[PDB]
């Protein structure tokens with residue numbers, strides 16, 4: 001029944017990939033947490049695109065996003081991610097981490113409502129200091145891997161202070177992978193604007209009889225290693241027999 | 245092309261490869277065009293069997309017979325032939341493992357009058373619930389074709405059925421079968437064995453970034469040995485049509 005255990009054997013997966021970072025797991029049935037690094041599990045970083053989870057919730061709950069079908073027209077400014085230079089709905093904007101769509105949401109939400117909602121969500125340090133459309137990229141907001149798990153457990157249980165409908169739509173938008181053995185609902189992030197540059201993957205694995213929450217971050221000096229966010233998480237999930 | 249339904253007999257090669265007979269129906273939502281290997285069998289009506297778990301789930305949720313997708317339905321303690329049925333279930337695992345006994349209990353609590361009204365409102369197949377209120381989708385009067393399954397699924401996809409948006413969102417969650425970075429499949433299997441001819445079903449849709457492809461297939465299923473062919477043949481057609489890589 002001991003709340004948090006360190007499992008340093010997971011460091012072998014970081015070392016194999018010449019990488020540094022943390023994986024945090026939470027067994028919902030047992031109410032027990034596991035991590036390779038208790039210190040880094042509680043270190044706070046810019047959320048970057050993992051902020052698209054609360055941003056989606058707030059946009060839906062305020063009617064900035066009507067539903068997951070509403071089209072957000074490309075503003076016609078060519079950016080260096082090809083998938084961003086096109087129309088999106090909530091599903092594809094989350095999938096392709098389409099920053100400019102979410103910047104527009106944030107502008108329409110505005111500072112007062114963004115701040116109130118992140119306090120109601122107990123989200124990270126709850127600090128939106130900076131620009132309302134970029135604070136999750138280079139403003140004051142910080143969140144640890146353990147704080148990501150706390151937030152995700154509320155979302156999973158529809159316990160956040162927004163409608164059940166808003167929570168159901170965001171959980172649909174988080175869908176990443178599914179088969180006959182598991183479902184992954186998750187969101188990637190890449191924080192580059194303030195050091196240290198890190199990759200995120202946060203979400204959960206739905207099994208028939210349990211839910212395993214996860215939050216990982218890792219040093220990401222270049223975009224070359226971004227695939228390691230999922231690969232290292234899956235190495236840990238497989239070692240723990242959570243997925244085959 | 246303007247044609248509602250187009251016949252593509254090349255898909256019969258996927259049936260023949262597996263010494264099988266049946267139909268695949270596809271509907272391109274963007275183009276409002278349908279495709280099938282067999283226009284006649286596409287419109288032949290059969291017992292829905294476990295594909296009936298889609299409307300049954302919707303009606304159970306809408307009436308409050310099922311509170312949500314977490315509510316536990318305790319095993320009645322009767323050992324049945326399918327191991328996965330002999331345990332507690334929620335809506336997600338009851339759909340996944342086609343747990344008939346749970347859905348029979350839903351049907352009893354919904355009752356004949358409300359079941360009949362709802363299937364009329366859904367324009368579901370021949371709308372006929374004659375037989376036992378807790379088995380009519382297995383051995384009663386209800387019949388539905390592959391094209392009628394697509395018509396019903398399009399209403400569900402668009403939240404247009406006459407039940408709450410919430411009921412429709414929960415059932416679409418319960419239908420989740422497969423997802424990756426290229427596509428999402430929401431679907432339901434069926435195996436009709438109580439009245440001849442014995443057939444297998446797979447009905448649902450493929451969500452892409454920019455389109456939805458609805459599908460409904462059935463095939464002759466004399467034994468449970470071939471049940472894997474429902475998904476395998478459908479995927480061979482989806483690949484041929486470049487819907488999935």
Ligand SMILES: C[C@@H](O)[C@@H](C(=O)O)[C@H]1C[C@H](SCCNC=N)C(C(=O)O)=N1
Nearest residue numbers: 048049050097099137188189190191223
């Ligand atoms: C701040 C954004 O740039 C960043 C974020 O918000 O986290 C975007 C960029 C990439 S999508 C392609 C990744 N390649 C980046 N060089 C991404 C992600 O992997 O989640 N999010």
Ligand SMILES: C[C@@H](O)[C@@H](C(=O)O)[C@H]1C[C@H](SCCNC=N)C(C(=O)O)=N1
Nearest residue numbers: 293294295342344433434435436437468
């Ligand atoms: C038998 C029917 O109740 C059937 C139905 O209601 O459609 C059940 C069992 C089969 S899978 C198991 C088939 N037999 C295996 N030995 C099934 C399905 O494939 O969805 N549902």
Ligand SMILES: [Br-]
Nearest residue numbers: 164165168410
């Ligand atoms: Br809802």
Ligand SMILES: [Br-]
Nearest residue numbers: 172175417420
């Ligand atoms: Br889903």
